[PDB]
Ligand binder design. Structure first.
Ligand SMILES: O=C(/C=C/c1ccc(O)cc1)c1c(O)cc(O)cc1O
Ligand SMILES: O=C(/C=C/c1ccc(O)cc1)c1c(O)cc(O)cc1O
Ligand SMILES: O=C1C[C@@H](c2ccc(O)cc2)Oc2cc(O)cc(O)c21
Ligand SMILES: O=C1C[C@@H](c2ccc(O)cc2)Oc2cc(O)cc(O)c21
Ligand SMILES: O=C1C[C@@H](c2ccc(O)cc2)Oc2cc(O)cc(O)c21
Ligand SMILES: O=C1C[C@@H](c2ccc(O)cc2)Oc2cc(O)cc(O)c21
Ligand SMILES: O=C1C[C@@H](c2ccc(O)cc2)Oc2cc(O)cc(O)c21
Ligand SMILES: O=C1C[C@@H](c2ccc(O)cc2)Oc2cc(O)cc(O)c21
Ligand SMILES: O=C1C[C@@H](c2ccc(O)cc2)Oc2cc(O)cc(O)c21
Ligand SMILES: [Cl-]
Ligand SMILES: [Cl-]
Ligand SMILES: [Cl-]
Ligand SMILES: [Cl-]
Ligand SMILES: [Cl-]
Ligand SMILES: [Cl-]
Ligand SMILES: [Cl-]
Ligand SMILES: [Cl-]
Ligand SMILES: [Cl-]
Ligand SMILES: [Cl-]
Ligand SMILES: [Cl-]
Ligand SMILES: [Cl-]
Ligand SMILES: [Cl-]
Ligand SMILES: [Cl-]
Ligand SMILES: [Cl-]
Ligand SMILES: [Cl-]
Ligand SMILES: [Cl-]
Lengths: 259, 259, 259, 282, 282, 282
């Protein structure tokens, strides 16, 4: 039967719940998981990259901050088509990975957030026309999912009519982009992915912590302050640079170790 | 004037009928054929690779064993769409290649077997969940086409009800995958491609030669023992390693000669 | 919210209107524009290449000869879909580029010609079967657009019944290929792209200047001799080699400067 | 005249003194500096790589911890030969980089290209402003000189938290007596600790560029907790030397007489093989 | 404490003694060993490549035919300098690899890491076990010393069947006498045969690592039949030397005093340039 | 015997004497010659690159302007050591290449491989036919010896029109006298011109291969108009030397005692890193 052309970009928010786990998790990612993953999807994924997170900022924990990385894929077909379940070689995936990332507690576990999007941002709300010449960006990529039972249209209205205007009013914020999550692909609980750029951490803080104190607490709030959503369950995020050396289809040459 | 998205994996079974032809055939493949091919299909083939065959095992001749390599393409469009017949630069093809591969005797000819498949295996019959951590595989890839006149459903039933249970019972066999050949693309006479993994040549032989002696000779048989098909005409195969260095779109740097 | 699978090859005719602009234009292209472009379209462009123009041949100015290069993209999706207008990082594009290329004058400016085509030539009009072994080609790529008010079918008929037979008849011409421009993509004013191969510049001249003197001047002619179309507005062209080192998705490593 | 074959490995300890500087410094390193550097030395440097530092561990500030990265080169000739001062294209090197790294304090007009009589990049790499931290650039032989613990360890043995530390004894301290202290008092503590899986050391080639450091050591643990147990708690058993410039081990002035970084076994920034220009996220 | 500039080409003759071992040995080589090796010597080896052996020709066993590959390095310094024994990460080298290649007989617990006083990889590469075949690692200059037939041959002249053979004369045989036999009796048979298109030779650098071999020759043919016609049938003309260890040419004990491989002009496994990790078939 | 460590940069001035030859010469260089060359010297050449020439400026013919490219190598050992004459595979090198480049006049049977008693490529590269132009292959140190103008210029300062010129004084002229004219009369005119942003020079290493040239200079401008203003108009102030072989600067015989090219700062043809075979346009 036919396979549908379905160009998409996806983001996975990869936490590391203890610094003691960092060397093991990073080793699995770069030594074991890159080659397994390239082996599977090289013919139908056009780009596969990791964007290591900047140091977690003050209060970043309340935003479900991914302390390892954002993992990004660009797909030509849906990876959730049931025909793609079959693989000659399955990935080497120890249970420990789920512990390191926080899906399994070693107090409450966190879901694994794997959000599919169109390849192009749907909404350009601030900073259209910004070029790389204009300077280094502190790119705060945030996904949110309204609580079960909350009308999606109500939440959309809050996000674009109450939240985004505070971003627009802050000169510290240089860029605001958004897309709806493709819920039809894999059941992801998130509803929106936004990327919100600052010059630096102080600017992120000024706007996302201090300026947002102006917002009323919504009746569905899951925490007392913005983003008003349960960390790691209904909000995940990461702050990343413009560039990553881990453009894995182009740049990987095996696990070469330091002398 | 639309072009259909038609993601496919194809396999060509490349023999070398005499050791005296090996240097010439290998030279044409790596020095001439790679650059011509990449020149033509770089924009719509996402992977192009050669898997050199392991040394022919005992009785491998009876299985249409490809003594040079399996050639693998992953396509985004059908190469058989008539619009793709037009090429700025046509491939440099000495017709001696056909002598070297055995399509032309220098003895009747053997056909050129080029089988199109979906990119993902259709049936996972044994070893689901095996990872590269489980060990090196001796991967026996075999394509079969039932003789003219044999009902294809009764061939399918023999294959899955008599042959595959013998693989399932053998501990030497670690993996069985299969896909129906896309006969609609190019007229290929083959009906199935299977891949059957062992630890080694001895395991391959214990199962595919000794255990298969329990099978009854079908009425349509073209040889006396399994696979009961005419070698190189109705069955072709190769045993290959998990890995090849000949991943041509990523790894080719021109024909560099030994000093 | 589906994206259509629309594989296409596009060509941009990049002039350099004074030699004093060459170092600046070339620097912008290779230092600034390559990384901007790759950043944008890596997940949906399978090939991106520059073919530097051979030295402008005698009377080449009358063919809208692009004195810098042909820029070539192979797309999987239409870049003119309005959803693709949104980009996180906009290309660094100084106004000076348009002066250097000749869109912005100083006497008259020239349009920016960006012609979309199918990935495979539609008409193979001479030289089918030619291989790279047959020798080095002087590849003259020319796009034409009939003037405003001229009936397109009447231009087509002139092109294929009067112009092409002269090319076909000349032993100096080794290859003729043509496609209709996909005018529905971006409104490009051109109607056809042809590629016409010679051994060298002398052969080009013999045919495209001397043999073409046999044509009657059409009633819509915008200049006295073939191509009878206004240079850079209704005709653009470049002569290029079979090979380019600038296959940018595979070969670019940053702007490494000479020692 | 001839050029001497002089194979060496060098290490530069790159700090980032405020998180607000991080995006700017990182951009300069990866977008501007890599291409300038590769352009200059491609013909005589066989490896050029960056090892980004793990998050600064508790009390890492006392060890001159580099909050950005370790920069590593493998040379075939000495970069400090005076004939190598001449370069067709000099590095684009604003004074801001020294501010971001902590070599100099923040100031007006630091977007300006560095000024020196000779090469800007070479001069920046000798920075020693009394109000900042010196620029530490240590040359070594390509092979570790002393293997003091964990010989035979393979990559199959597991992920390492590799703590690379360089030390330089203070002005007036006899080098031979610092050496003896290092190898007879310090190193036995590392050997005794089950948490330390490797100890390697080389003498700094001071003759190359006047680097004030004397030794580079690399000391491996499983993780930050192991590093802390050994390098902070276990070292409390040491007597404070008469020359100490701080109260606890390393007893040396942070960022002036000791620099360090903890890094992973692998880096994706193997720049002569892996760099493809400054591709930006979509 | 200087390191000498010592440009060299080395060849290792890699056998596979049973077809059942091939998938395991090939996996170790390509999945495990490449990255360990590149990690160790990237800064001072300018090329590292594998040339898989063509199928063993008839009577190839008598020439110590390597059934897996030739491994080739181009070195800038001697790997045998004792300072190069020290390695941050040692090679993952199970004893099994020695069984698969035929250095040692099969035995219990050969999945263990090689046990050595010094570096395991270096020890492995000196394997010289009485019940197996020695590990043959021959160092050469980068340029062939003697060009004896086919000077001026280009790649346009056609595909070569390149037979690379190393020989070492037995215990007690004068080296000058063996040299004289090689060049005055053996080589003129190659020169007369039109099936032989190329003859090249170099003296083994015996001083680097104690290699028992004395010469490396490379001898080209069009194909296996040409090889056999010359190296088997034409060589029957030679008289059997008094030192002979087998009845026919090469008159040397297979795998101990002669190793060989027939290889193609090109390899995809130019590892410093072409390796991208162990990507597995779908 | 040992090989001397001899790091050098070499330049070859590649002309194309007729536009009709351009497709053929260009094909040979990129399709045939790159792989033959990389095959030979990958282990001891650290960089191999082609810089295509900008279009020949007005009066460029009087400067021996290379209408194809500059070919650049960075060597670790001398290519002219006699031991390097031996090569397993010689370059595919038809006489026609010498026609295309202007080393020899056009003639029958020039598709023939070059015939030499030693290596054909090395012999091609010593071409010096009385009816053509010699083959100019100049060896230099890897670092410019003299920095005479524009020290400290970065790539941020803008695009360069880089005019690389080599000169050799005629038979009989005292080399010290030529040197003094170059540096006391010619260079000051470059230093004085505001259009000139950079002047670098090195002495040709004449001991390597007997190159006739004595100096290589690189002289930068903004563009072709700047080049002409300085190198044609400003140079009219110079007195004609008594050894002049043409009436105006450079006063040397085009293509025999002066060769040159104007090139950009960047080339895509960094051949050891960037070459992936001869992929043809669709
Ligand atoms: O983490 C994660 C994973 C892979 C595919 C999905 O559609 C969802 C999750 C994950 C994984 O990589 C492997 C696995 O077996 C289970 C997981 O949740
Ligand atoms: O033309 C090819 C094969 C044709 C064929 C020849 C003989 C048969 O009995 C069946 C098919 C062909 C090939 O064998 C190899 C290749 O790489 C490209 C080809 O077109
Ligand atoms: O890179 C990915 C992809 C993902 C995945 C698995 C299977 C599949 O079919 C598609 C994607 O699994 C992961 C699990 C992780 O913990 C961390 C990651 O970075 C990833
Ligand atoms: O991998 C998961 C998903 C996770 C989960 C989901 C949703 C949610 O709201 C909280 C946790 O629960 C778990 C609990 C476990 O013991 C082990 C697990 O592997 C998991
Ligand atoms: O590191 O972008 C553009 C490109 C064009 O051609 C014209 C434009 O207006 C804009
Ligand atoms: O970019 C353009 C296009 C150009 C033009 C378009 C179409 C055509 O037929 C002729 C010229 O006119 C211009 C005139 C300007 O002052 C500045 C410009 O940027 C331009
Ligand atoms: O990456 C390098 C290269 C280094 C260097 C360049 C040229 C040279 O000759 C010697 C060293 O300078 C630097 C200075 C830094 O602050 C940070 C860095 O990462 C680097
Ligand atoms: O590929 C190599 C590299 C070689 C080697 C590594 C490091 C070193 O220092 C010297 C040699 O060891 C080997 C040993 C083998 O059995 C087979 C091999 O292919 C190789
Ligand atoms: O590209 C080169 C390499 C050069 C060369 C090869 C081998 C060697 O030993 C020395 C030099 O020969 C050439 C000769 C040319 O006409 C044009 C060229 O571009 C070149
Ligand atoms: Cl923690
Ligand atoms: Cl900035
Ligand atoms: Cl709260
Ligand atoms: Cl195994
Ligand atoms: Cl039978
Ligand atoms: Cl002009
Ligand atoms: Cl030709
Ligand atoms: Cl006119
Ligand atoms: Cl681990
Ligand atoms: Cl002292
Ligand atoms: Cl203190
Ligand atoms: Cl051949
Ligand atoms: Cl015998
Ligand atoms: Cl001409
Ligand atoms: Cl002729
Ligand atoms: Cl500029
Ligand atoms: Cl004159």
């Amino acid at each position: 039967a036919d396979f549908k052309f379905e160009p998409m970009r996806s983001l996975i928010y990869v936490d590391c719940v203890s610094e003691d786990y960092r060397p093991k998790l990073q080793r699995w990612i770069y030594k074991v998981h890159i080659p397994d993953s390239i082996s599977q999807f090289e013919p139908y994924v056009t780009k596969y990259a990791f964007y290591p997170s900047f140091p977690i900022p003050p209060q970043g924990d309340r935003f479900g901050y991914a302390r390892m990385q954002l993992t990004e894929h660009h797909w030509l077909v849906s990876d959730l088509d049931p025909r793609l379940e079959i693989k000659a070689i399955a990935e080497t995936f120890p249970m420990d990975v789920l512990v390191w990332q926080g899906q399994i507690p070693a107090a409450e576990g966190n879901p694994f957030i794997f959000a599919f999007l169109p390849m192009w941002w749907e909404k350009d709300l601030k900073g259209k026309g910004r070029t790389i010449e204009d300077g280094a960006n502190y790119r705060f990529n945030m996904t949110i999912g309204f609580p079960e039972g909350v009308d999606k249209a109500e939440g959309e209205k809050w996000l674009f009519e109450k939240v985004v205007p505070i971003l627009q009013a802050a000169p510290e914020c240089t860029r605001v982009l958004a897309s709806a999550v493709k819920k039809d692909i894999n059941g992801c609980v998130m509803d929106w992915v936004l990327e919100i750029w600052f010059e630096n951490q102080s600017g992120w803080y000024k706007v996302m912590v201090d300026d947002m104190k102006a917002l009323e607490k919504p009746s569905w709030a899951q925490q007392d302050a913005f983003p008003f959503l349960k960390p790691y369950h209904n909000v995940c995020s990461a702050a990343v640079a413009d560039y990553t050396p881990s453009n894995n289809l182009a740049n990987y040459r095996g696990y070469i170790t330091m002398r």
